[PDB]
């Protein structure tokens, strides 16, 4: 059961007696979308300061494990431990992250962390193609709007930061009205609330800055061509649904219909996905996957693919977009029936895995928007209630003759112009 109390800070807890671990954490409603192009990467630097050697050493001496996660809409700082020592994690979180920040922002520590983060971002930008392609897709989809800033930070901006930027961001965003205290695993809600009440655990006053511009989607493309690479990596997307939309689960199911494909695994060549019937003959791709990502203001629905067949890219894109076209007009009931159970198993593993850190992140990110956490059972009935008419109604609105965003790198010379791709979003025979 999920129990949430608004006394003090918003305290959420999900109790699981079977687990042998307990996680206690703080989730902030600010993310990479709350920063600007001149201090971009301040959140990643804060994360790596919390994860620095001295802080991690003092934590691990007591027997605790530290996790930090940076995203568009939230920042997560989690302390995981054994069930008997769940009170010690609160003490470490109070003493280190909240009460005092002078020790963590010393000159030498800041310089070392800055040099390590610069090295990491430099390695990412050159030797991680499928993920940086998705980052550029975000950066070109939401350009000149908060949601397009990369979460790690750019190489040029990360140099200009000083400790003053970090402390300014901490003053502006680490607030009581922006925070949720989350408890996961083998702990009780009453015990957690009592433990918080015994201490003060006050973060700050409130009134975080309000953004003047809301995120917007622009049809656009960016091409980063490099002929010294062996493949071509391509990510393509349209505007999707945000969190708290009525069509959220319909979006995830429509994504699940096409699924993912790996050419080298024997089993995934026999899937009921009809798209493979066009792909398999000439080995058009090595792998693809479909995504329905949702944020607070907007979302992305699309796919990502990698291939060595540098002379047949347009055929791959054409067949994929013709499979997308089929959703509006001629989706069949068996497709939806398979999609329901595939999605239920897909959602089942996500929310019911052994690791409590994923549960903590999900619960903290959920209560910061909805105000409450949807149960597993009520999720299934909405999934089971989906019909063919709903899928057709959603697809006729979100992907029929709509603008797209594209991002590719590698031997993308075979990738045709924008308009030729944009015309594939309709059939013209219907």
């Amino acid at each position: 059961e999920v129990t949430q109390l608004s006394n003090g800070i918003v305290v959420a807890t999900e109790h699981n007696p079977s687990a042998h671990t307990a996680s206690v954490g703080v989730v902030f409603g600010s993310g990479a979308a709350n920063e600007n192009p001149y201090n971009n990467g301040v959140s990643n630097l804060w994360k790596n300061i919390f994860l620095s050697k001295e802080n991690s050493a003092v934590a691990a001496k007591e027997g605790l494990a530290l996790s930090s996660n940076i995203s568009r809409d939230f920042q997560s700082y989690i302390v995981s431990s054994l069930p008997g020592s769940t009170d010690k994690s609160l003490d470490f979180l109070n003493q280190s992250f909240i009460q005092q920040k002078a020790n963590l922002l010393s000159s030498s520590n800041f310089e070392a962390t800055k040099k390590s983060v610069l090295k990491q971002v430099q390695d990412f930008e050159e030797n991680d193609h499928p993920n940086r392609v998705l980052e550029h897709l975000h950066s070109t989809a939401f350009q000149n709007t908060p949601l397009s800033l990369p979460t790690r930070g750019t190489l040029e901006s990360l140099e200009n930061l000083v400790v003053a930027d970090l402390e300014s961001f901490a003053n502006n965003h680490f607030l009581n009205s922006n925070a949720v205290v989350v408890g996961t695993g083998n702990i009780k809600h009453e015990d957690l609330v009592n433990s918080i009440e015994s201490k003060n655990l006050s973060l700050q006053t409130g009134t975080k800055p309000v953004l003047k511009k809301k995120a917007a989607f622009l049809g656009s493309e960016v091409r980063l061509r490099d002929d010294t690479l062996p493949k071509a990596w391509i990510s393509l997307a349209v505007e999707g649904e945000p969190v708290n939309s009525p069509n959220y689960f319909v979006a995830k199911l429509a994504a699940q219909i096409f699924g993912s494909y790996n050419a080298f695994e024997p089993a995934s060549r026999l899937q009921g996905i009809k798209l493979l019937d066009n792909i398999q003959e000439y080995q058009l791709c090595d792998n693809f996957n479909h995504f329905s990502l949702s944020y607070k203001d907007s979302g992305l629905w699309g796919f990502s693919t990698a291939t060595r067949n540098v002379t047949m890219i347009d055929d791959l894109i054409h067949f994929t977009l013709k499979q997308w076209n089929r959703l509006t007009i001629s989706v069949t009931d068996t497709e939806v029936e398979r999609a329901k159970s595939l999605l239920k198993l897909q959602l089942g593993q996500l929310y019911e895995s052994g690791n409590p850190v994923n549960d903590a992140n999900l619960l903290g990110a959920e209560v910061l928007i909805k105000g409450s956490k949807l149960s597993l059972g009520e999720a299934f009935k909405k999934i089971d209630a989906i019909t063919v008419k709903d899928v057709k109604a959603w697809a006729g609105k979100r992907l029929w003759d709509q603008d797209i965003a594209i991002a590719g790198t590698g031997q993308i010379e075979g990738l045709l112009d924008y308009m030729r791709i944009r015309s594939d979003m309709s059939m013209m025979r219907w």
Partner: protein, 92 residues
């Protein structure tokens, strides 16, 4: 199929140019931008620029063959005029 010769063009994927790296491109969908955005200030200022550059390449080459044809036309008019038959008989 039978082998073919060696040409100076390929196709999509092997076009035959040099290897390129470090060049990035940005574009925006035409459904999101307004065409005809600068037709004025291009029909006036841009056209005048191009004209002032390439107009002595066409005028002087046309300024030589216009005076050459005219001094022959107005000379042929005098040679076949009543006052220019005496010069006609010495050139006929």
């Amino acid at each position: 199929g039978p082998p073919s010769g060696k040409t100076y063009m390929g196709w999509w994927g092997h076009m035959g140019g040099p290897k390129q790296k470090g060049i990035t491109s940005y574009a925006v969908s035409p459904y999101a931008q307004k065409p005809l955005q600068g037709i004025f200030h291009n029909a006036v200022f841009n056209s005048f620029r191009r004209f002032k550059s390439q107009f002595l390449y066409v005028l002087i080459p046309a300024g030589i063959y216009w005076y050459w044809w005219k001094n022959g036309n107005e000379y042929n008019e005098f040679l076949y005029s009543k006052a220019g038959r005496e010069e006609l008989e010495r050139v006929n």
